């Protein structure tokens, strides 16, 4: 029957972005990569098979895919090519994704808010909000 992650499953398209350039700066992304990545209107496809959650992010810039089990650390290569150690957990009904590399850490939270899937990206002082709607 039902599971807490059911509300995230689906195909989602980016419909707004706030402070993403400043967040990518903080994470270490170069000028050319930020300008190009900033144009992207990614889709995000979330699916579940048993305990394995798969998230694809796809755009003209790059396609990425992660598959994971809640709470189990995994190796991820991000869109900007950081090789990170990632752990995704559910905090109530919020998917909390922590990426660690070179002694730095960034937290990405995915939540449902009305008909949207809201993505909050935090690195040190720096917060970006990316809003997706069903495709
Ligand atoms: O890969 C993503 N973003 C991104 C894009 C391009 C570059 Cl160069 C760097 C990144 C980041 F820094 F997030 F890895 N995914 C998100 C998005 O909304 O677009 C942001 C976090 C989870 C969804």
Swiss-Prot record:
<keyword id="KW-0446">Lipid-binding</keyword>
<dbReference type="GO" id="GO:0015908">
    <property type="term" value="P:fatty acid transport"/>
</dbReference>
<dbReference type="InterPro" id="IPR012674">
    <property type="entry name" value="Calycin"/>
</dbReference>
<protein>
    <recommendedName>
        <fullName>Fatty acid-binding protein, adipocyte</fullName>
    </recommendedName>
</protein>
<feature type="modified residue" description="Phosphotyrosine; by Tyr-kinases">
    <location>
        <position position="23"/>
    </location>
</feature>
<dbReference type="GO" id="GO:0070062">
    <property type="term" value="C:extracellular exosome"/>
</dbReference>
<feature type="modified residue" description="Phosphoserine">
    <location>
        <position position="16"/>
    </location>
</feature>
<dbReference type="GO" id="GO:0120162">
    <property type="term" value="P:positive regulation of cold-induced thermogenesis"/>
</dbReference>
<dbReference type="Pfam" id="PF00061">
    <property type="entry name" value="Lipocalin"/>
</dbReference>
<comment type="similarity">
    <text>Belongs to the calycin superfamily. Fatty-acid binding protein (FABP) family.</text>
</comment>
<dbReference type="GO" id="GO:0005737">
    <property type="term" value="C:cytoplasm"/>
</dbReference>
<dbReference type="GO" id="GO:0050873">
    <property type="term" value="P:brown fat cell differentiation"/>
</dbReference>
<feature type="short sequence motif" description="Nuclear localization signal">
    <location>
        <begin position="25"/>
        <end position="35"/>
    </location>
</feature>
<dbReference type="InterPro" id="IPR000566">
    <property type="entry name" value="Lipocln_cytosolic_FA-bd_dom"/>
</dbReference>
<dbReference type="GO" id="GO:0042632">
    <property type="term" value="P:cholesterol homeostasis"/>
</dbReference>
<keyword id="KW-0597">Phosphoprotein</keyword>
<dbReference type="GO" id="GO:0036041">
    <property type="term" value="F:long-chain fatty acid binding"/>
</dbReference>
<dbReference type="GO" id="GO:0051427">
    <property type="term" value="F:hormone receptor binding"/>
</dbReference>
<dbReference type="GO" id="GO:0050729">
    <property type="term" value="P:positive regulation of inflammatory response"/>
</dbReference>
<feature type="modified residue" description="N-acetylcysteine">
    <location>
        <position position="5"/>
    </location>
</feature>
<dbReference type="GO" id="GO:0071285">
    <property type="term" value="P:cellular response to lithium ion"/>
</dbReference>
<dbReference type="GO" id="GO:0015909">
    <property type="term" value="P:long-chain fatty acid transport"/>
</dbReference>
<dbReference type="GO" id="GO:0005811">
    <property type="term" value="C:lipid droplet"/>
</dbReference>
<dbReference type="GO" id="GO:0005504">
    <property type="term" value="F:fatty acid binding"/>
</dbReference>
<dbReference type="GO" id="GO:0045892">
    <property type="term" value="P:negative regulation of DNA-templated transcription"/>
</dbReference>
<keyword id="KW-0007">Acetylation</keyword>
<dbReference type="GO" id="GO:0050872">
    <property type="term" value="P:white fat cell differentiation"/>
</dbReference>
<dbReference type="InterPro" id="IPR031259">
    <property type="entry name" value="ILBP"/>
</dbReference>
<comment type="subunit">
    <text>Monomer. Homodimer. Interacts with PPARG.</text>
</comment>
<dbReference type="GO" id="GO:0009617">
    <property type="term" value="P:response to bacterium"/>
</dbReference>
<dbReference type="InterPro" id="IPR000463">
    <property type="entry name" value="Fatty_acid-bd"/>
</dbReference>
<keyword id="KW-0963">Cytoplasm</keyword>
<dbReference type="GO" id="GO:0005324">
    <property type="term" value="F:long-chain fatty acid transmembrane transporter activity"/>
</dbReference>
<keyword id="KW-0813">Transport</keyword>
<dbReference type="GO" id="GO:0005634">
    <property type="term" value="C:nucleus"/>
</dbReference>
<keyword id="KW-0539">Nucleus</keyword>
<dbReference type="GO" id="GO:0071356">
    <property type="term" value="P:cellular response to tumor necrosis factor"/>
</dbReference>
<dbReference type="GO" id="GO:0005829">
    <property type="term" value="C:cytosol"/>
</dbReference>
<feature type="binding site">
    <location>
        <begin position="130"/>
        <end position="132"/>
    </location>
    <ligand>
        <name>a fatty acid</name>
    </ligand>
</feature>
<comment type="function">
    <text>Lipid transport protein in adipocytes. Binds both long chain fatty acids and retinoic acid. Delivers long-chain fatty acids and retinoic acid to their cognate receptors in the nucleus.</text>
</comment>
């Amino acid at each position: 029957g039902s599971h807490m992650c059911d509300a995230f499953v689906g195909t989602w398209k980016l419909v707004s972005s706030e402070n993403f350039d400043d967040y990518m700066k903080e994470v270490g992304v170069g000028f050319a990569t930020r300008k190009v990545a900033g144009m992207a209107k990614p889709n995000m496809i979330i699916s579940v098979n048993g305990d394995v959650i798969t998230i694809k992010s796809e755009s003209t810039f790059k396609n990425t895919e992660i598959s994971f089990i809640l709470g189990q650390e995994f190796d991820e290569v991000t869109a900007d090519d950081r090789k990170v150690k990632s752990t995704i957990t559910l905090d109530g009904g919020v998917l909390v994704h922590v990426q660690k590399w070179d002694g730095k850490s960034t937290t990405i939270k995915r939540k449902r808010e009305d008909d949207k899937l809201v993505v909050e990206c935090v690195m040190k002082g720096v917060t970006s909000t990316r809003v997706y709607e069903r495709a």
